[PDB]
Each structure stands twice: as structure tokens, then as C-alpha cells.
Amino acid sequence: FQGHMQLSRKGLDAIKFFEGLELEAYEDSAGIPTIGYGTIRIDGKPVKMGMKITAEQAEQYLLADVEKFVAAVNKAIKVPTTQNEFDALVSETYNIGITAMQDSTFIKRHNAGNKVGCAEAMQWWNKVTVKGKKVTSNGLKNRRRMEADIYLDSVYPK
């Protein structure tokens, strides 16, 4: 089985919620110019300081950004998958990246029908590298618990 699922409206709303929104470019904590819903590239080109966009543009850029992540989750899933399970897996993959999702325990458990196990293993992805050392991010712990709620219970953030 290969996926042809799409991110739902509720799934896009959840990724928006996790990213936050700025209409003026800002330099993130790592020094990368960022705009909209966590966008760092627009139509293949970097975000630039001083740029201002509309909320409509921000949604357009986020839709373009998430497309390859939707594709990758479709290709990684080997079993029938509910819309909320798909939304959660795309949200998490959008944060951890394609390679991390592909080789993850959570995707193995999803493909074995072990939903509870998948929700547990999803939440292992809470570390960030700081000064060459892996540090637990409280922000990521929060995002992981909200993505597990989408995956298991179809309960989306507000």
C-alpha cells in the first residue's frame, strides 16, 4: 500500500498553531531569517530581512513547504491510516525531517498496527543539539504531546 492522502484543514491549522505567525521577517535563535508560519525559503529562494508578507502569502508558503513532507509520509505508511493519524505524522515529520521519520520507531509501530506504541515513540523526538550536546526542549515536549493527541484521539490544538 502507498498513500495518496492530503493534510486536512484541521491538520494545516495544527501546523500553523505549532509554528506561530509573523508577517515581518525575523532572525530565529539559530540566526536564520524566518517569516510567516516558520518559512525560511520562498519559491526556492531564502527569506530576507526587511520582508513583509500578508497572512494569505504566509498560508501559500506553508502549503508549498509541507508538500514534500505529505509526499514522504504517504510513501512511508504501509497500512490504512485515519485522517488524524496522517495529520499527526505529517506535523511531526515537518519538524523532525524526512530521514528521521523514515528510520523512526514510531513509523515502524504505526505500520505494525501498534497505535499506542506509535504515540509513545512519537514523543521520543524532544531533543535539540545545543553547543554539541543533546538538550531536552520543553517546547518540543509540548508539541509532541499535542501531536500524540491528534494521532490517538483526533483532538487538535486550540
Author numbering: -3 to 154
Q: Can you list sentences taken from the study reporting this PDB entry?
A:
However, the development of endolysins as mainstream antibacterial agents first requires a comprehensive biochemical understanding. This study defines the atomic structure and enzymatic function of Escherichia coli O157:H7 phage FAHEc1 endolysin, LysF1. This group contains phage endolysins, such as the well-studied T4 lysozyme (T4L), and bacterial autolysins, which cleave the β-1,4 glycosidic bond between N-acetylmuramic acid and N-acetylglucosamine in peptidoglycan. The multisequence alignment reveals that LysF1 contains these conserved residues with Glu15, Asp24 and Thr30.
To better understand the mechanism by which LysF1 functions, we crystallized LysF1 and solved the structure to a maximum resolution of 1.71 Å. The structure contains two protein molecules in the asymmetric unit each comprising the full endolysin sequence derived from FAHEc1 (residues 1–154) and two phosphates. The completed model reveals that the overall architecture of LysF1 consists of three regions, a catalytic loop region (Glu15–Lys41), a connector helix (α2, Ala51–Lys71) and a C-terminal α-helix bundle (α3–α7, Gln79–Asp149). A putative catalytic residue Glu15 is positioned at the C-terminal end of α1 facing into the cleft. The catalytic residues of LysF1 are positioned 8.9 Å apart, consistent with T4L-like endolysins, which would accommodate the peptidoglycan and water molecule between the side chains for catalysis. Therefore, the catalytic site of LysF1 is consistent with a peptidoglycan hydrolase that inverts the anomeric center of the peptidoglycan glycoside during catalysis.
